[model samples]
Structure formats: structure tokens, C-alpha cells
Target: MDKAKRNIKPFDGEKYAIWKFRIRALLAEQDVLKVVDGLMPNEVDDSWKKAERCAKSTIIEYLSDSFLNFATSDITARQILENLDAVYERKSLASQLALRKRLLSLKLSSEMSLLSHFHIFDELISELLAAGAKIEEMDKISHLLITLPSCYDGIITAIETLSEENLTLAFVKNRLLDQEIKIKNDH
Candidate 1:
């Protein structure tokens, strides 16, 4: 396949979680993740080696040269993936703490739309969860409610009073959006 036409984005370290997720999806889409996972069928010796090499090459092609320095001909596709994970996955306690701080400090600015604010919160939540933070769904909803401006006080109270079993992130988000729109229309 032509490299230019592949249109795969190179992973240059920024947004590592998002990049890793996309690369995994791309590899799976190519039907080569089985090779990476060492689950390829037991074909002839040469055929298996060829398949493994192709899978490794596909992964390397999407990586920046800086990261490619870690690759070795002797390394299997699964080993390469593990190396990438070791370097990029940030699940340390420090990482979780920093993510929690960001999540806690996140607030809806007057200039920010409710949807945009929700997206930022979503990203933070995703990162925190990925980093092995133990956050409950109810806590997430409550934190989101607490961060909203006092203009949302009424909606916040109503949401807080709802049974925990009936609350979800989407439900809270949609309700908040509805309330935001209603308030805007009233003014």
C-alpha cells in the first residue's frame, strides 16, 4: 500500500491515550491485530513469520521515527506493542492525582457552551478512568453538577434529588443541556 494514501496519523506523543486507541482500532480494522496479539493461525513457518513482519511493519509505519528507535528486528509485534504501552501509558499514582486535580478544577466558564464544557469534562473523566482512578458514576455526576455556575442551581438541586439508580452521565448531561437551553430562552 502507498504510504501517502494510507492517511494514518503518526503518534508523536501528544494525546497518547487517543493516539493509542486510534492505532489499536486501525490495526484491528486491518485484520492484523490477531498477529499482534500472537493469535494468528498456525500456518507454515515462513507464512507465519511473514504475517508477523507485516503486522509489525504496519504498526511502525504509523509511528514517528523517534518512537521507532525502540523497534528491533528480533522483536515481535506483541513486544513492540508492550514497549509502546510502557512508554506511553500513564497510569501512575501521580498521573491519577494530576488528572483528578484537573477534573476537580474544571468549571463551565461564562464564555463556554454547555456542550463544550461537557466535552472537556468527558475527556478528563476518560483520562482519569484510563489512569486507574476509582471514580463512581454518582461522584462524576455530582462533580459535574458542583462545577456548574450558580445559574444552574435549580437544575443541580433537581438532579441531585434524583435516585442514584436512575442517574447516568448521559442523563445528567442531557438534562443539564435542556435546563441551559430553557434558561437561555427565558432570558
Candidate 2:
């Protein structure tokens, strides 16, 4: 059988870091990464032309139509990647604040499982951290508590009542899960 083709996710202009690393790996695996990185000599051979064409086509093919438009005027794979970085990487600040608002908007609905709620909580935190947001441990704990509904007010108080030495994100997760069981059993 022929070697299977590798498919890259089309870049959507969000989650630039994930797309960036994934595409870089694909380029490296194809052996055209040096061309994309401009490590290839400016004045080149047939093999160099071959690598450049492959890298440029692969890069544009994986981009969304809007992003592909940005690279249309860009001749080299290196220049195309640079164009994307300028547009996407510079939005880290905008994304950081928007992600924070999203987390703040989250609430534990009565119909939602605690595990489900925690999954989204973890995802947002992961994205925010990856985007260079410095969310301290204590901030995570407080933000988590704030996201909980009025039903969790008692648990919130209990946590606050604890000595600073004992209150922790790990302990908070356990206590919240334990309380979830209590709430479910009562209902």
C-alpha cells in the first residue's frame, strides 16, 4: 500500500499555538521544514525548488480560506508562516481577556454533572495558561468558587472558614466533588 497522507487541521485563526506546533511537526516530517524556515540557500537547486513548492502548497492548503488569502501574496513558506504569526500571536492579549470572561460566565447548572463543569473549567484554564496568562493558584481557587451557584454557597463558606494553610485547589476539588454527591443524594 502507498504511504498514507498526513492531514493537518485547518487553522481557524484561534488556538494559534496548537495549530503552529502541529503544522511545524507536519512540515518537519515531510522533510521540507528547512525550506519553510528559510535555512535553504536563497539561490537554489532543483531539489530546493521541489522542497519550496511542497512546503508552500502544504502550508496554504491547511489554512482557512481567509488565512490563505493573507499568504497569497507571500512567495516563500517562511513568509507565509511569519504573516500568520503576526496576525495570531499578537492577539494573545485579546484572547486572554476573552477567555477570562468566558470562565467567569460559567456556572454549575442543576442539570450539569460536577465532572462536566470541571471539564470546561480545566479547558479554559489550560487555554489561558497556554496564551501566557499568569493565573496564580489562589486565583484559580477563588475563580472556581465564584463560578459555583448559590447551592454551593455553604461549601464556599466552609472553604473560606478554613485556615489559609489548609485551603488549597486540590482540597477544594475533593470537597466540591464530595458536596456534589451530598447534593445529588438529597435530590
In order, what is each prediction's RMSD in angstroms? 2.5, 3.8
Q: Across residues 1-187, which tens digit of lDDT does each residue of candidate 2 receive?
A: 1224565677778777778777888877877777766576878679887777777777777778887787875467777887788877774767788877877887777568888988978987787787656678887777777778777778788788886468767777888888888888988
For residues 69-169, what per-residue lDDT tens digits would candidate 1 score against the true structure?
77777778778777878877847978888878877887786457887887888887787788866678877777777778877887677777788666777
TM-score list, all predictions: 0.84, 0.70
Model 2 weakest lDDT span, ten residues long: 1-10
- Candidate 2 off by > 4 Å: 1-7, 28-53, 92-94, 130-132, 163-165
Number of residue pairs clashing in candidate 1, backbone atoms closer than 3 angstroms, sequence gap of 3 or more or interchain: 0
Q: After superposition, how far is residue 148 of candidate 2 from its true place, in Å?
A: 1.3
In TM-score terms, candidate 2 sits at 0.70
* RMSD to native, candidate 1: 2.5
Best by TM-score: 1
